[PDB]
Design a protein around this nucleic acid. Structure first.
Length: 156
RNA sequence: AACUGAAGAGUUUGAUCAUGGCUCAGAUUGAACGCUGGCGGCAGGCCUAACACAUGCAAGUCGAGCGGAUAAAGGGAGCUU
């Protein structure tokens, strides 16, 4: 589906000769409010056209996320580049408390109780990779129990 | 009766990623200063010169321990209040 959310806008450039050609980039994540997200990056020549391009690439190559219901399954920790990310599920009344670019991922996924923090280099185009290695590699235990459930899930 | 939290931003460049400094958003004080100023509860008030101090007051009490001297009421008498 489609619920859109913008994060970043830049002004990249390019020197040719004579002057300097400008261009705009944008980063936009799209989710469904249930656990299907997708991010997208587009470059164009103006703001109202660079956002439209980044929205279209978001709703291609999406991710199914197996959330527990407004929370996560377990504390995990993933990294990409020089960016390290930590996330652990929380109680009911606590909302989402994260920084800038992990709120926009964790809104549209539908989770509400995420309690996150990012270390290392804060790059909004690169902390998103650090988040999607984490969420796309969840497990959601298909087991008979948890304190007992290590005889039917390990064979899954 | 026993008992739960973790946010980032700006700044090196024609522009980008990284390393690395700096700076801001918070909660606090025996606080001082500037502008302004109705009320009441509960608190606190020399952090500097352990530097000198006028004048008041802050440890006395026992006559069921003993001398001594003050000697009432009253008992009076006497003399004339």
């Amino acid at each position: 589906g489609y619920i859109e959310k913008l994060v970043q806008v830049n002004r990249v450039a390019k020197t040719v000769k004579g002057g300097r050609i400008f261009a705009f980039t944008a980063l936009t994540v799209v989710g469904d409010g249930k656990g299907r997200v997708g991010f997208g990056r587009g470059k164009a020549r103006e703001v109202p056209a660079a956002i439209q391009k980044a929205m279209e690439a978001a709703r291609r190559n999406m991710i199914q996320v197996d959330l527990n219901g407004t929370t996560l399954q377990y504390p995990t920790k993933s990294a990409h580049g020089a960016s390290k990310v930590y996330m652990q599920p929380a109680s009911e009344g606590t909302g989402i408390i994260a920084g800038g670019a992990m709120r926009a991922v964790l809104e549209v996924a539908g989770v509400q109780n995420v309690l996150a923090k990012c270390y290392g280099s804060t790059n909004p185009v690169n902390v998103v990779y650090a988040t999607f290695k984490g969420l796309k590699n969840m497990q959601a235990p298909e087991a008979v129990a948890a304190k007992r459930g290590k005889s039917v899930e390990e064979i899954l």
